[PDB]
Symmetry: D2
Subunit: 208 residues, 4 copies
């Protein structure tokens, strides 16, 4: 039936990503922001099914923003929690992603240069948005999305980093550069390797 | 059933709007451009139906652009044919719309000053789009929409003028100012009066 | 000389808007966020000035995003500080704005109905942006702008409310509804009345 | 001094791209559309010079839409005329572009599959816009731009194809598929090769 999504539990405790991300942020981000996206996604999808069955095209178009914003919020945050892990986990080691790092090194020259390029794109976002490493065809690309827009159909998301102010402000204030510097310690490279090796449908399987 | 829209017949013959709009433009515009929007709207809606029942949010979001573009294309042209009529028809006399023209005069000063204001907005559209007279509450506003974006936000559309190049190029070449000057002769003020006196749902009944 | 905008001083101390807006937010909002928009605006205008003289149109177009983002950031925040004041100030009383409130009541029915309608627009902003009460001709309208986009040429801004998360998150966390409820206590209605009675050029004289 | 652009002459006669593009379109496209972009760009640049000297940031921002639209119009058409040539010319032979066609074949598999992917992107444009083959770093990409937006700062334009309806409507009516199929015969692969081997400013040297 339509609109039966639920907030996924995190793979770790709310304080497991410290000191990179504070427990307060993880709790607010998951139990408030992501929760709201889930509930509002379900509400909009059920109303949309009514508009679709009645062939009400004006209502359908008017509902697109709520589905894109809340649907994207659910897609993006679901992907986000999964490509994070405690800094002490072996999954935080890029040696967990040999195939991905090889393609990363082939594209940007080195892992450090990819990190520099992505950091630049993350800090360059005006307003709210996300930075993504994506697979397009067989090649890798850094892309940004505004607000909660999900990665555009055709690209395989490898990992994403949330640059909305609620992802860092309580801990880093306006210092988003320090936030980006610290989040590398908690990137789940095992997850990134698995997404790089699968296709679009495989990546979105966590939503199931 | 989902996605069973069909192209409505015009209220007049293809040459009935001459000399303001040529028979060739009317036939191509109706039987090709509008027909394509109808067909591609129906295709997108059937695909959407599958993704909605499967709770496939990435596909639902990816389908939004086709639904808005082709759905808006169907909405906009359906309204368009109805707010046109042969220049010799009594429906082309603005005296057919006493309440609307009085409110127009209250807002812009006179019918001529509104025509100049709407003309300016139409000629100012960069690229493809539409100009609309809309009712917001009890007041009137001139708005433009890009591409085939419809006036679906809550406003009641009173009449629209298509500024896509296919609406005039074969007859007026790049002279869109001459096209706008001549379309006033075939504006259906009887239709505009009914929309001005009705609500949002009445105006969209044309889609039935 | 090109690109000499500076950070305007606030009309009050950093803690003057408590309890509606904390001193910590005011100091960060003013001394870091707004200051950054000023500096990057000046940098963008200096580069643009040469690209304009060189008839280098690709550079001019490539610089537009920084000029709109940082220029709007400077415009919006400069307007913002001026239509805020301490809650006990006489300027926080809407009786300080007789002509504006009369037109507000004529348009929305009452001041409460207008506050709710603007609240709805503020809370509906997806992502970062601003809510504005503006004058177009003789009538009032509620509009929202994305990111730091300033109010569209032709409208006179009457007052604006910042809905960027940095404007409230340290104090209200995700509770933007409570932020909006409390910011009504520190709206400067004397400033709003003055903007309502002047034109677009008047409201932009503070820069 | 500011705003002294002029309409460049075509590299060939108005009928030189026939039969792919008619002389009627070439003359209107060049002497009316592109000419209007030049004139309106110069006016906007002069007005900006006034707003800049007055330290008027609101007017500067309000002027951006006219500078991007007319400045982009001038850039895109200037590049466009240069990457077209008579179909019987040796420059129309893709063998004139050995390094570029090798990178195309390495990226898309063959020239025919690249033409197929670009054709799909060109026909997929909603409203007015352009399709581009661009270079980013060492890689090739098909991108589209809306209205007269020029290619995003950072990419090197290799060649563009105008999908505004004024580019084909008089000759092909709504048949943009026939227009694209025929324009391949007049693509200047000598121009494309030179741009592929140069950088961003080299490609914009045509504006001098
Ligand atoms: Mn988030
Ligand atoms: Mn049309
Ligand atoms: Mn702010
Ligand atoms: Mn063109």
């Amino acid at each position: 039936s339509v609109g039966t999504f639920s907030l996924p539990a995190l793979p770790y405790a709310y304080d497991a990503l410290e000191p990179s991300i504070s427990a307060q942020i993880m709790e607010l981000h998951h139990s408030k922001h992501h929760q709201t996206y889930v509930t509002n996604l379900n509400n909009a999808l059920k109303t949309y099914s009514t508009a679709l069955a009645a062939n009400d095209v004006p209502s359908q178009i008017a509902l697109q923003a709520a589905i894109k914003f809340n649907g994207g919020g659910h897609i993006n945050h679901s992907l986000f929690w999964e490509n994070l892990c405690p800094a002490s986990s072996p999954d935080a080691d890029p040696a967990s992603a040999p195939e991905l790092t090889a393609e990363i090194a082939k594209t940007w020259g080195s892992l450090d240069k990819f990190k520099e390029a992505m950091g630049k794109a993350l800090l360059g976002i005006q307003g709210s948005g996300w930075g993504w490493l994506v697979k397009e065809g067989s090649g890798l690309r850094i892309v940004t999305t505004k607000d909660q827009d999900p990665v555009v159909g055709g690209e395989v998301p490898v990992f994403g980093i949330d640059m909305w102010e609620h992802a860092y402000y309580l801990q880093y204030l306006n210092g988003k550069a320090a936030y980006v510097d610290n989040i590398w310690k908690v990137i789940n490279w095992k997850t990134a390797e698995q997404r790089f090796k699968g296709d679009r449908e495989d990546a979105f399987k966590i939503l199931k």
